[PDB]
Swiss-Prot record, chain A:
Family, similarity comment: Belongs to the ORC4 family.
Boundaries of the shown chain within the full protein: 328 to 431 of 436
Protein name: Origin recognition complex subunit 4
Superkingdom as given in the UniProt entry: Eukaryota
Lineage, uppermost ranks: Eukaryota, Metazoa, Chordata, Craniata, Vertebrata
Organism from which the protein derives: Homo sapiens (Human)
Subunit composition and interactions: Component of ORC, a complex composed of at least 6 subunits: ORC1, ORC2, ORC3, ORC4, ORC5 and ORC6. ORC is regulated in a cell-cycle dependent manner. It is sequentially assembled at the exit from anaphase of mitosis and disassembled as cells enter S phase. Interacts with DBF4. Interacts with POLQ.
Swiss-Prot record, chain B:
Assembly with partners or alone: Component of the MCM2-7 complex. The complex forms a toroidal hexameric ring with the proposed subunit order MCM2-MCM6-MCM4-MCM7-MCM3-MCM5. Component of the CMG helicase complex, a hexameric ring of related MCM2-7 subunits stabilized by CDC45 and the tetrameric GINS complex. May interact with MCM10. Interacts with TIPIN. Interacts with CDT1. Interacts with MCMBP. Interacts with DDI2.
Coiled-coil regions listed: none
Gene label: MCM6
Protein name: DNA replication licensing factor MCM6
Subcellular location: Nucleus; Chromosome
Residues of the full protein shown: 412 to 616 of 821
Miscellaneous comment: Early fractionation of eukaryotic MCM proteins yielded a variety of dimeric, trimeric and tetrameric complexes with unclear biological significance. Specifically a MCM467 subcomplex is shown to have in vitro helicase activity which is inhibited by the MCM2 subunit. The MCM2-7 hexamer is the proposed physiological active complex.
Length: 104, 197
């Protein structure tokens, strides 16, 4: 999810985003690959996004509730590309596919 | 390599020059047909460079020869049909010369839907900055520039390839039942998923 977020920040220079775009491009990544074992449904990815927001790596803009759901909410990342690269280098068991997707 | 190959540029070619033209003969005082590139490339291969720059008025003329393999002329009291048994190899670049990832794939190609449909193989090339690829490309180019002949290792001679291709083209293989049902199931899976199939 973080790599997808970085790709979104690179393609759209300094603009917010929501859950749907991240989900769509994660689906694109898992569909381009032939048969990789990443068949996950919407609720589990939603829970993972909620956990990421809970750890306060992502912060909302102009906070409001009720009018806007958790979906369709403008999120931003609080990390730098070099930090992500350095952290990913020290990841214990990073698979090859996700590493190459991050490089791409 | 292929002696039966014809080359042409995109914009410099007109509609008449591609398929055929109707011209009045000076001595006979009548109308005859002057051949175009496509009918000269019969049973060969025709290569088009910068296919994007061609006007739609030219590609619509190409349309018939693309699929029906023949060209029909019904102009100025001249009625005829001609064989256009050719294989077309087209080269082009995306819109504005760069593949913009901020836009959709469909928005990156300015080609009509039937033209997109009528190509069997459609390859799209994207350039990326990788150090190993850069090193390989640079060493290959410099080796070719410095060592012109000793840097070429060909497994088979070009004339040998030509003779083998000539010998092979006359065979007409039959389709097996196993190949038949394998093709059926493969097409099932493929079609169950812009460039519509």
């Amino acid at each position: 999810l973080i790599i997808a977020m970085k790709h979104l920040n690179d393609i759209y220079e300094e603009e917010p985003f929501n859950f749907q775009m991240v989900y769509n491009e994660f689906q694109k990544f898992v569909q381009r690959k032939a048969h990789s074992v990443y068949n996950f449904e919407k609720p589990v990815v939603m829970k993972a996004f909620e956990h990421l927001q809970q750890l306060e790596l992502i912060k909302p803009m102009e906070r409001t509730s009720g009018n806007s759901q958790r979906e369709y909410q403008l999120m931003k990342l609080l990390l730098d590309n070099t930090q992500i690269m350095n952290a990913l280098q020290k990841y214990p068991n990073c698979p090859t596919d996700v590493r190459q997707w991050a490089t791409s | 390599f292929s002696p039966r190959a014809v080359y042409t540029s995109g914009k410099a070619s007109s509609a008449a020059g591609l398929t055929a033209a109707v011209v009045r003969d000076e001595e006979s005082h009548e109308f005859v047909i002057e051949a175009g590139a496509l009918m000269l490339a019969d049973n060969g291969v025709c290569c088009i460079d910068e296919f994007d720059k061609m006007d739609v008025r030219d590609q619509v003329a190409i349309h018939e020869a693309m699929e029906q393999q023949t060209i029909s002329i019904t102009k100025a009291g001249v009625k005829a049909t001609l064989n256009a048994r050719t294989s077309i190899l087209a080269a082009a670049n995306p819109i504005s010369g760069h593949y913009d990832r901020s836009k959709s794939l469909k928005q990156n190609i300015n080609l009509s839907a039937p033209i997109m449909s009528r190509f069997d193989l459609f390859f799209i090339l994207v350039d990326e900055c990788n150090e190993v690829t850069d090193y390989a490309i640079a060493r290959r180019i410099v080796d070719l520039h410095s060592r012109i002949e000793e840097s070429i290792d060909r497994v088979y001679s070009l004339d040998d390839i030509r003779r083998y291709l000539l010998f092979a083209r006359q065979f007409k293989p039959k389709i097996s039942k196993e190949s038949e049902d394998f093709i059926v199931e493969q097409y099932k899976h493929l079609r169950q998923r812009s460039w519509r199939i």
